Amino acid sequence: MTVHFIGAGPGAADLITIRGRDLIASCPVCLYAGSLVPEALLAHCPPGAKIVNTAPMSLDAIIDTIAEAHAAGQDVARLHSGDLSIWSAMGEQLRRLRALNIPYDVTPGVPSFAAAAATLGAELTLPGVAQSVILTRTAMPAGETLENFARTGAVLAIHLSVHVLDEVVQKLVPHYGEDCPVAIVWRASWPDQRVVRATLATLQTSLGAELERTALILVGRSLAT
Amino acid sequence: MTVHFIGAGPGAADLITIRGRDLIASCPVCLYAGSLVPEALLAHCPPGAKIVNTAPMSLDAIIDTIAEAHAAGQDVARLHSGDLSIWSAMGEQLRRLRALNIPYDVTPGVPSFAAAAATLGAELTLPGVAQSVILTRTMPAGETLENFARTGAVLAIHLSVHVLDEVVQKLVPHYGEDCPVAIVWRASWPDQRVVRATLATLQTSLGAELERTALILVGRSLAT
Description:
2 copies of one chain form a homodimer.
Chain A: E1 3-7, H1 18-26, E2 29-32, E3 50-53, H2 59-71, E4 76-80, H3 91-100, E5 104-107, H4 112-120, E6 133-137, H5 146-150, E7 155-161, H6 165-176, E8 181-186, E9 194-199, E10 214-219
Helix pairs in contact in A: 2-3
């Protein structure tokens, strides 16, 4: 047996990869990270599959469940939302699996910044304007500061609490300017999707009625309309 | 009709999204950007499709071709490798299309950095180590090697094998000579090649150079 870590993508069931879909279809055990993974993907699980919601489970119980599948020789479709390379929390699971010598592989998914850019119809890189993209969130490691990032002029993709938005704006404005385009996306790709396009000066006044805490913000001239 | 911009992913045909494959299957015209789009995806094109490699074509030639499909009322699958949000040249094309009131949408794909990290079995963001990832290539004013390196973020750098020396020398001061690094050629392709090492030992470890370009991933979070 093998544990197959799978990037489920941003939310829409048709934005999983073909490989990921095939793997869900052929595993008798499926461990999935709660309602961030659309239940429509669970329809691909073969009959016979036991389906396990890891979201309210502890790290220890997740590993015990994988261990009992491993003892039974049963493959696992381990679904995380988005892509596995960023903010999946796959690493701590991998470290626990290497300590038990349970085999695993990784199938990449669509990251939410890509899904966000697609909904906006935007190429983030624009010759002359920006050729780089920085992915980050708001204890951050030593040199990982908004100012350090803002100095580059790169397109920024920041995962954040709406509660700290005011600080984010203050730190970016000296670098990018009052009038710099920014776009906020909530629940990218879900039926529920909301998209606000604004400027740094006008972002806070352009959040209307939307009460959700976490969002993704994209900042740069290449986000102009 | 619509022009459907589709992220083909890193190379393997099964790394396209469900939606992308379905869109290729439904478009009587397919404009694909070079042989970085796998043959196996082209086999999803419908019977009698007009299939055209856009890679040697100028922007005007690509737009003319699109206009021709628009006049016939024929959907276009515009396939680019990776994801369209980065280094796709979609932006210029979208501008020309808005000019002509030709409708389009965008389907995201899997970018190469994700594919490369996957074959390494790496989460790049690990608590207390790295919470940022910089996607760059070897340029606008502030986008220098030094300005990115001074942050300590994980770096995903699409580069020419020939400047690899120079890139390494500019990263050592910020990342340390023993900092983990990996080179990936042709991520997800049947012939993909990977070398994992350290900044100081990468060059002795290299071996066969499958292509003149490659993607390097730099940071402690690679192996830790």
